[PDB]
Every structure is written in C-alpha cells, then in structure tokens.
C-alpha cells in the first residue's frame, strides 16, 4: 500500500519527439560537478567506482562505498567496485542491466549509453538534496583534496 517503495528508482522514459542528449564534454563535466570527479575521458566512467558513488547520493543504504575501490588501477579491480554496484539495482528494482564484462573493457561506446542514461536516470530520482562525495571519505585534511587543477599552455604563431 502507501507505505513503502520509499527507496526506489524511479525508470526513465523519455519517449517523446524532444531529444536532449549532451556530448563527450559535458557528459563528462556532470560527474566531474556531481560528486567532484577528475575524469578527462568517458571511457574513465569504465572503473565504475564513480557509478556507485552515484547510488549513494541517489538512493542512501542502497550501496556500499566501502566496498568499492576509487583507487581502482588495474581491470579486476573494476569489476569488484561494478558488483557491490549491482546490488544496489536489484535492491530497490532496477531493470538497468550492468554490463560489466564490458564496461570494464574500458571502450568508449559502450560507455557513452550507460552514462548517457545516468544523467536522465538521476534526475529521475534527484529532487534537490545536498551530498558530499568527499565527506565520504575523508580522513585527514592534510591528503590531498581532488581538484581538476589542469592547465596546458600551447598555440604556435608566426609573424
């Protein structure tokens, strides 16, 4: 009845002539202003650590950071973070397969639909909450904070 489906998600459908799809930049500069992210290419997404610090901030108790890797450098380490992930779909009814095998490949297509939909799909259940990705995990304020501190000077020019 009324009470319960607290925690849920709520599908995406969209099925309208309107098509309001971003690009490699943007898709991009969404995660990277969600939950403070440092990915310069989607294929990076491929770790998956940063889909489940989406759950999190999405839908509370229905993943677990602590099982996730967000140091994750080598292929094996990508599929752990992907399967705690994994719970947190079938937890609440997502009908949104991961496909891991692949995503972990770390291709740039295959990645493109899964985060493509990630935007839509946590405007689906994001309301207007406050998160701290960093409080997540953070420890002592001496590490070193994440920032996209990134500059590269460059164009030649003759006269």
Same mark, same amino acid.
């Given at each position: 009845?009324? *009470?319960? *489906?607290?925690?849920?998600?709520? /599908?995406?459908? *969209?099925?309208?002539?309107?098509? =309001?799809?971003? *690009?490699?930049?943007?898709?991009?500069?969404?995660? /990277?202003?969600?939950?403070?992210? /440092?990915?310069?290419?989607?294929?990076?997404?491929?770790?998956?650590?940063?889909?489940?610090?989406?759950?999190?901030?999405?839908?509370?108790?229905c993943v677990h950071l602590r099982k996730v890797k967000f140091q994750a450098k080598l292929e094996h380490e990508y599929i752990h973070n992907f399967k705690?992930?994994?719970?947190?779909?079938?937890?609440?009814?997502?009908?949104?397969?991961?496909?891991? =095998?692949?995503?972990?490949?770390g291709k740039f297509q295959d990645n493109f639909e899964f985060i493509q939909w990630f935007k839509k799909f946590f405007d689906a259940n994001y309301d207007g909450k406050d998160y701290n990705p960093l409080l997540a995990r953070q420890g002592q304020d001496v590490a070193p904070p994440p920032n996209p501190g990134d500059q590269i000077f460059s164009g030649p020019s003759s006269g």
């Open positions: 009845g009324s *009470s319960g *489906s607290s925690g849920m998600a709520v /599908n995406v459908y *969209s099925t309208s002539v309107t098509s =309001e799809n971003l *690009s490699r930049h943007d898709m991009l500069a969404w995660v /990277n202003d969600s939950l403070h992210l /440092n990915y310069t290419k989607i294929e990076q997404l491929c770790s998956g650590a940063a889909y489940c610090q989406f759950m999190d901030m999405l839908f509370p108790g705690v992930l994994q719970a947190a779909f079938k937890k609440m009814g997502v009908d949104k397969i991961i496909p891991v =095998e692949k995503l972990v490949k």
